[PDB]
Amino acid sequence: MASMERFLSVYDEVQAFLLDQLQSKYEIDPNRARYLRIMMDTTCLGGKYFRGMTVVNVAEGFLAVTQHDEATKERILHDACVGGWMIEFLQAHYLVEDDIMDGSVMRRGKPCWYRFPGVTTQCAINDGIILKSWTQIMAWHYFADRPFLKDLLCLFQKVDYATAVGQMYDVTSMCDSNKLDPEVAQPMTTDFAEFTPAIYKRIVKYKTTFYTYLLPLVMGLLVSEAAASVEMNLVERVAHLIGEYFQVQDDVMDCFTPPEQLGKVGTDIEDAKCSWLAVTFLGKANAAQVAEFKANYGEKDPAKVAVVKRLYSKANLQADFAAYEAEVVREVESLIEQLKVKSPTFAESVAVVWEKTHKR
Amino acid sequence: MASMERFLSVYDEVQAFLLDQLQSKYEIDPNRARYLRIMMDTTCLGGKYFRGMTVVNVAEGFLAVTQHDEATKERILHDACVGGWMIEFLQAHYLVEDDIMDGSVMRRGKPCWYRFPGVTTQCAINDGIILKSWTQIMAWHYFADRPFLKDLLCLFQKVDYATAVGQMYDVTSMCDSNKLDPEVAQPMTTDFAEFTPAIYKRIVKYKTTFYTYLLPLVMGLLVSEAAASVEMNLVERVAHLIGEYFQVQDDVMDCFTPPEQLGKVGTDIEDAKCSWLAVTFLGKANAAQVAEFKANYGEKDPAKVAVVKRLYSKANLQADFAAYEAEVVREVESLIEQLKVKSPTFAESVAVVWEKTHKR
Numbered sequence: 001m002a003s004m005e006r007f008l009s010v011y012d013e014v015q016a017f018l019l020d021q022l023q024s025k026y027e028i029d030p031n032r033a034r035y036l037r038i039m040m041d042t043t044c045l046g047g048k049y050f051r052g053m054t055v056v057n058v059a060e061g062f063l064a065v066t067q068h069d070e071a072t073k074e075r076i077l078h079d080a081c082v083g084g085w086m087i088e089f090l091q092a093h094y095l096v097e098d099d100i101m102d103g104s105v106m107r108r109g110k111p112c113w114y115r116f117p118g119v120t121t122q123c124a125i126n127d128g129i130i131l132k133s134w135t136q137i138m139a140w141h142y143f144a145d146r147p148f149l150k151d152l153l154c155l156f157q158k159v160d161y162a163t164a165v166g167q168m169y170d171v172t173s174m175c176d177s178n179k180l181d182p183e184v185a186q187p188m189t190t191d192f193a194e195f196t197p198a199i200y201k202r203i204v205k206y207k208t209t210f211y212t213y214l215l216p217l218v219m220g221l222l223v224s225e226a227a228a229s230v231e232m233n234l235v236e237r238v239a240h241l242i243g244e245y246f247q248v249q250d251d252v253m254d255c256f257t258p259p260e261q262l263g264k265v266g267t268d269i270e271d272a273k274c275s276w277l278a279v280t281f282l283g284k285a286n287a288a289q290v291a292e293f294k295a296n297y298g299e300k301d302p303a304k305v306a307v308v309k310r311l312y313s314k315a316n317l318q319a320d321f322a323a324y325e326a327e328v329v330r331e332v333e334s335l336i337e338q339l340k341v342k343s344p345t346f347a348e349s350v351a352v353v354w355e356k357t358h359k360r
Numbered sequence: 361m362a363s364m365e366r367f368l369s370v371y372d373e374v375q376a377f378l379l380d381q382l383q384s385k386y387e388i389d390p391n392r393a394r395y396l397r398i399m400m401d402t403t404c405l406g407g408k409y410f411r412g413m414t415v416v417n418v419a420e421g422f423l424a425v426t427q428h429d430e431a432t433k434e435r436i437l438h439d440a441c442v443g444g445w446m447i448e449f450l451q452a453h454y455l456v457e458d459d460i461m462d463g464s465v466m467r468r469g470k471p472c473w474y475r476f477p478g479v480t481t482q483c484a485i486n487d488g489i490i491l492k493s494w495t496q497i498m499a500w501h502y503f504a505d506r507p508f509l510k511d512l513l514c515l516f517q518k519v520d521y522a523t524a525v526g527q528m529y530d531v532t533s534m535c536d537s538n539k540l541d542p543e544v545a546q547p548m549t550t551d552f553a554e555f556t557p558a559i560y561k562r563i564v565k566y567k568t569t570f571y572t573y574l575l576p577l578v579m580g581l582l583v584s585e586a587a588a589s590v591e592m593n594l595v596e597r598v599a600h601l602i603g604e605y606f607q608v609q610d611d612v613m614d615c616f617t618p619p620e621q622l623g624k625v626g627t628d629i630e631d632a633k634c635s636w637l638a639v640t641f642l643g644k645a646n647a648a649q650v651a652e653f654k655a656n657y658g659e660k661d662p663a664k665v666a667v668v669k670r671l672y673s674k675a676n677l678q679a680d681f682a683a684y685e686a687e688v689v690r691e692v693e694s695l696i697e698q699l700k701v702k703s704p705t706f707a708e709s710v711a712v713v714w715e716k717t718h719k720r
């Protein structure tokens with residue numbers, strides 16, 4: 001609430017710093033500075049800020065229980081907000097480049113950036129590059145003298161690289177692994193043997209969890225100088241868990257949430273994605289339902305897509321979701337409890353992160 | 361010669377490290393590891409290695425005049441080769457993403473990566489992301505304990521960001537600055553007021569010089585722990601100079617070097633680029649020649665392109681090139697001499713870099 005104002009306010013500072021620096025050090029002209037400003041705003045702003053605000057909230061938790069001078073509280077909260085924007089700008093990179101890669105139309109109820117008339121794909125691929133370069137420029141500027149700079153940079157790169165590896169897993173999820181080959185055009189799988197829970201879990205862990213949950217939680221710990229206050233294997237395990245559930249929810253929404261509320265027309269079925277819905281359906285389907293899914297999945301035709309959605313509706317996937325969800329609730333609660341051994345306040349931040357995901 | 365073997369040999373190590381790490385830590389499967397291997401080879405190998413080998417040569421120069429244990433000579437040369445591959449992989453990122461951005465057909469006498477049948481644009485944009493992420497993973501792995509890690513990472517990011525800003529300057533070079541606007545489709549300039557030597561110099565400095573010459577020279581100094589042995593403003597000035605000349609040469613080749621030798625059909629004229637040829641032509645053209653260039657530049661039509669090439673041939677741009685070249689030779693020689701005040705060996709490495717550029 002008040003946390004948000006500080007958080008959203010640090011955007012203006014960061015932007016001024018970056019745009020001012022472009023003028024004083026990179027010979028930018030006013031008109032290109034404006035184009036960048038607009039790019040930054042369009043691509044960084046207008047989501048939920050779940051990732052950035054997680055950094056802020058984790059730091060606020062340690063601030064309530066740790067003795068510091070006022071000026072030191074302000075420095076830590078500023079660092080948390082910069083760190084959170086590093087994550088939001090990394091998210092912006094991903095979304096610009098993915099929207100190009102997938103040929104997407106809308107994002108956040110507006111056209112994808114590459115579709116803006118004065119952008120185009122030739123400028124947008126590089127605008128996405130710039131978005132990620134800005135994360136580094138922010139980090140070296142604001143955190144130059146900080147004891148956590150090294151750990152923060154190393155964590156960020158590992159997380160970015162995991163994320164790119166997860167994009168590869170995602171875009172290749174409807175190919176047969178044994179047929180991947182740069183020299184040969186890739187056909188869609190016909191057996192769907194690789195639509196399994198373990199393979200789905202690998203996709204979602206790399207493409208989503210490391211940067212949506214692991215990174216915000218650990219960055220909050222690092223800006224607070226509190227990483228030795230937690231059991232890092234537990235932080236990982238809980239991030240894994242909550243991130244998977246987050247994505248399962250997005251998978252179900254793609255198919256069943258109205259376009260206006262989603263902020264886009266979902267096309268996971270036409271795109272033959274290894275979604276939770278597809279994997280769960282195949283987990284319980286009879287021989288006839290499997291052959292009907294195969295006849296219809298991964299085609300642009302609305303009739304075939306509606307046959308897929310029928311199959312899902314008829315298979316009572318709501319119940320497998322409640323079973324899955326209950327199991328997630330067991331495990332996240334167990335992990336929060338184990339997190340209390342070394343840190344009550346960090347476990348509570350995790351509890352709050354879980355509540356915000358479970359209830360979105 | 362022998363420098364090259366070590367250099368090219370470190371590729372195999374780096375690749376094994378990266379692919380092995382993908383298996384042990386990122387849950388990669390054999391088939392995706394193979395796809396990545398092939399991607400790495402296709403996009404990183406088969407150029408001249410001018411950038412990577414510059415790091416190696418600068419380190420070899422200091423090695424001849426500096427007392428070290430044998431094991432320490434080997435460690436420094438290994439670091440130079442890793443650092444040089446960091447640059448080559450950053451080059452690979454650029455070339456993959458630019459070839460997509462510009463719709464290019466061939467690169468290094470083979471199809472651009474995105475055109476390979478089992479790649480496509482949807483995989484290639486992310487393959488390019490991975491290429492740049494590999495630079496960071498190499499750096500944190502090989503240079504974890506090194507005193508120069510911080511300086512090296514900070515230099516690399518600043519150089520990457522300058523480079524992305526230069527790509528923006530390049531792709532927007534045929535627009536009027538005052539008309540840039542994400543909301544409005546961009547028309548080509550009609551006045552060509554912004555085809556000037558200063559504006560050309562800004563483009564080439566950011567898009568080429570910082571990563572082709574500044575970065576290899578300074579990385580050679582950093583792996584050698586020799587940066588306090590040079591005057592850094594001179595290193596910058598000489599990098600600027602030689603990099604500009606390198607690009608002017610590429611600009612002339614785009615128009616006049618046969619496709620088979622170039623390894624591509626040049627399209628700078630159709631693409632309305634602010635090339636050295638266009639800026640130099642407009643610098644000396646009469647009113648009629650200016651109006652004929654305007655009628656014909658930045659169009660796909662071979663007849664119009666051949667009218668542009670005619671205009672260039674007839675304007676005796678060979679002579680403006682020799683005048684420019686002579687001026688470059690003056691200034692590079694002056695700078696090499698000034699570089700001798702603090703370091704004879706570094707000045708010689710610069711002399712050799714200049715010879716390799718001037719004579720390519």
Ligand SMILES: c1ccc(CCNc2nc3ccccc3[nH]2)cc1
Binds near residue numbers: 094164167207250489
């Ligand atoms: C280039 C490299 C890597 C990526 C993976 C991004 N992963 C991702 N994007 C998401 C959007 C919304 C919700 C969950 C998400 N997980 C994209 C582009």
Ligand SMILES: c1ccc(CCNc2nc3ccccc3[nH]2)cc1
Binds near residue numbers: 568
């Ligand atoms: C994304 C971001 C930045 C870039 C600029 C690359 N600059 C460049 N590429 C070159 C190739 C050959 C010779 C000189 C060059 N300068 C590209 C893609």
Ligand SMILES: [Zn+2]
Binds near residue numbers: 098102170
């Ligand atoms: Zn995607």
Ligand SMILES: [Zn+2]
Binds near residue numbers: 458461462
């Ligand atoms: Zn280009």
